Design a protein around this ligand. Structure first.
Ligand SMILES: Cn1c(=O)c2c(ncn2[C@@H]2CN(C(=O)[C@@H](N)CC(=O)O)C[C@@H](O)C[C@@]2(C)O)n(C)c1=O
Ligand SMILES: C[S@@+](CC[C@H](N)C(=O)[O-])C[C@H]1O[C@@H](n2cnc3c(N)ncnc32)[C@H](O)[C@@H]1O
Ligand SMILES: [Cl-]
Ligand SMILES: [Cl-]
Ligand SMILES: [Cl-]
Ligand SMILES: [Zn+2]
Ligand SMILES: [Zn+2]
Lengths: 116, 301
């Protein structure tokens, strides 16, 4: 019944003033892309930065199993678009946020499916 | 002049044709650094300009392309170069990378250990190596052709590089190998490319374009490295990050290059001509299987 909870550990470490994980691999791109959250190639728009996925995954970076029962990683081998204002902590951002399964945008950072 | 707006500078042909003696490398702008875009690593910028230059050559780009990347780990535990290669290569390209120490990567498969422990059943369309030991930067000792991972790379090319494939191998003043220069003569074209972001370094990427599996021209590797250092010594390259800001044409073009299985007897001049133009790859198209040799030891008592 014991499983280490790294997501909660990083969240608390952040709340208590810890330096976010560094050396997330930021890509050069046009910044005229679709803006979607996780893509097979950099897709940052004017308000985002594109990163290599594995370097932004808490589980990859910490050498710990992925919460997926299959161990599969949502980020490895892909590229994650981070809002420029949050690019100081890509790992924290991808951890705390969710991708809209309809439009592929970050919930609350581009997803307008719930607007009327 | 306009060199500052290119991704880098390639060794001009006339310098390849000289018979220089090896001298110490003395770069005018040693120690200077280019101004990278905000928050961009040197290695992202370096690999980006490498790929931008590779876009100007006649690379074979088949469906289900196979690329292997040696020396892919940084001291930061991540793989910046691999991330650029995967961005550059067409989506779906099989990308394997390797390094001595553990690192997290976006490659489809990653092998940890000395490159001599890496084995693959299949052949490859593109080999990238950034392998380097900084303890070769000893100026107080003579600068001879190095072996180590260069011996592996030379054999890996001759054994596991598909005809028509290409390579880009990192060298420096002291990190070089004569047989690798000689192997450049087994491609339809070759050069030593210096990225504009790292122009203050004796680093270059030895690029072999379209592998032919036989000597097209005879190259003395000791002379050619001396030729390279002479070029570097007499041609200051202006550090520049200009090309990093235009990525609109960055993706490698999926040329759909044809892949055939052929036998040494069937390689005629029509074939060799197609290979030389980046229009043909020769290898089997089976599944890609790799492995890392593991030494077993019991240290108890
Ligand atoms: C190890 N190594 C070097 O040392 C080196 C070098 N190119 C030039 N040099 C230094 C430069 N130099 C310095 O003082 C530097 N701090 C910066 C500067 O002034 O260029 C003094 C100068 O007399 C010449 C030389 C050779 O000594 N390359 C490629 C290299 O690999
Ligand atoms: C500076 S690093 C590569 C940087 C990396 N390409 C990047 O984009 O950040 C040079 C690498 O060469 C690797 N390497 C060097 N010699 C090797 C050898 N014989 N076998 C396996 N790996 C080697 C080193 O471990 C080292 O990690
Ligand atoms: Cl970490
Ligand atoms: Cl020669
Ligand atoms: Cl063959
Ligand atoms: Zn992961
Ligand atoms: Zn949505």
């Amino acid at each position: 019944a014991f499983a280490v909870d790294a997501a909660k550990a990083y969240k608390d470490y952040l709340a208590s003033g810890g330096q976010p994980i560094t050396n997330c691999v930021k890509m050069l791109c046009t910044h005229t892309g679709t803006g979607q959250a996780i893509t097979v190639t950099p897709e940052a728009n004017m308000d985002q930065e594109s990163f290599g996925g594995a370097s932004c995954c808490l589980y990859c970076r910490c050498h710990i199993d992925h919460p997926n029962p299959k161990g599969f990683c949502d980020l490895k081998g892909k590229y994650v678009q981070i809002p420029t204002t949050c690019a100081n902590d890509p790992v924290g951002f991808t951890l705390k946020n969710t991708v809209c399964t309809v439009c592929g945008m970050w919930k609350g950072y581009g997803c307008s499916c719930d607007q009327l | 002049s306009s060199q500052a707006w290119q991704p880098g500078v390639a060794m001009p042909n006339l310098y390849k044709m000289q018979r220089m003696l090896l001298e110490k490398c003395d770069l005018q702008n040693y120690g200077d650094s280019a101004t990278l875009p905000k928050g961009i690593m040197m290695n992202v910028a370096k690999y980006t300009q490498l790929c931008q230059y590779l876009n100007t050559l006649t690379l074979a780009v088949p469906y289900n392309m196979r690329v292997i990347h040696f020396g892919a780990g940084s001291d930061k535990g991540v793989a910046p170069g691999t991330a650029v290669l995967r961005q550059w290569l067409p989506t779906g390209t099989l990308l394997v990378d390797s390094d001595l120490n553990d690192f997290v990567s976006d490659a489809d498969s990653t092998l940890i250990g000395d490159c001599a422990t890496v084995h693959t059943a299949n052949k490859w369309d593109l080999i990238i190596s950034d392998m380097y030991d900084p303890k070769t930067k000893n100026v107080t000792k003579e600068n001879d052709s190095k072996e180590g991972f260069f011996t592996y790379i030379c054999g890996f090319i001759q054994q596991k590089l598909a005809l028509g494939g290409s390579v880009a191998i990192k060298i420096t003043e002291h990190s070089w190998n004569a047989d690798l220069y000689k192997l450049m003569g087994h491609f339809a074209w070759w050069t030593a490319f210096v990225t504009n972001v790292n122009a203050s370094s004796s680093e270059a990427f030895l690029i072999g374009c379209n592998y032919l599996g036989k000597p097209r021209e005879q190259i003395d590797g000791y002379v050619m490295h001396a030729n390279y250092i002479f070029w570097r010594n007499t041609n200051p390259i202006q550090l520049s990050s200009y090309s990093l800001f235009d990525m609109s044409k960055f993706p490698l073009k999926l040329r759909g290059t044809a892949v055939m299985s052929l036998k040494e007897g069937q390689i005629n001049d029509m074939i060799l001509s197609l290979l030389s133009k980046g229009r043909l790859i020769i290898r089997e198209n089976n599944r890609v299987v790799i492995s890392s040799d593991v030494l077993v030891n019991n240290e108890n008592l």
